[PDB]
């Protein structure tokens, strides 16, 4: 209920969501590339539309990466400021674990 604890929790949850976003976005690229091939053979009048969706799917990967990194920096900055005094050891461990998961997810 400490306001710094509450803010830290929100930032950790936000970061976790950006990481899951990238995972689903990467899985979807592979599907869009398949969805292209399917619609290619079944219905090539849809291929132009799906070519454009595939290209956008691929660009959504760096977009998702950029969001993870912006969230990692925000959390990291907070931990140097009002987050620096949080006494909840397990929340601090979780914040550090989640940052490490984000860094792993990019790279």
Numbering used by the authors: 19 to 125
Question: What do the study authors state?
Answer:
Tubulin-binding cofactor A (TBCA) participates in microtubule formation, a key process in eukaryotic biology to create the cytoskeleton. Tubulin-binding cofactor (TBC) proteins, of which there are at least five, are intimately involved in this assembly process, but the details about specific contributions are limited. In order to underpin dissection of TBC function and delineation of structure–activity relationships, we have instigated studies of the trypanosomatid proteins and now report a crystallographic study of one, TBCA, from Leishmania major. This protein is thought to make an early contribution to the assembly process through delivery of β-tubulin onto a second protein, TBCD. In one model for microtubule biogenesis this TBCD–β-tubulin complex then facilitates α/β-tubulin heterodimer formation.
The structure of LmTBCA was determined by the SAD approach and was refined to 1.9 Å resolution. There was no reliable electron density for the first 18 residues and the model comprises residues Glu19–Ser125. The protein fold consists of three α-helices (α1–α3) aligned in an antiparallel fashion. Helices α1 and α2, each comprising ten helical turns, are distorted, with bends of approximately 20–25°, giving the molecule an overall curved appearance. The proline at position 80 in LmTBCA is strictly conserved in these structures and appears to contribute to a bend in α2 in all cases, although the effect appears most pronounced in the Leishmania protein. Although LmTBCA did display a dimeric assembly, it is distinct from that observed for ScRbl2p and is driven by the formation of a disulfide linkage. However, the formation of this Cys58–Cys58 disulfide bond may have stabilized the structure of the α1–α2 loop, and as Cys58 is not a conserved residue in TBCA sequences, it may have fortuitously aided in the crystallization of LmTBCA. We do not ascribe any biological significance to the observation of a covalent dimer of LmTBCA formed owing to a disulfide linkage. The presence of a localized region enriched in basic residues, which are conserved in TBCA from evolutionarily diverse species, together with the overall acidic properties of the C-terminal tails of β-tubulins, hints that electrostatic forces might be relevant for complex formation, but further work is required to address such a hypothesis.
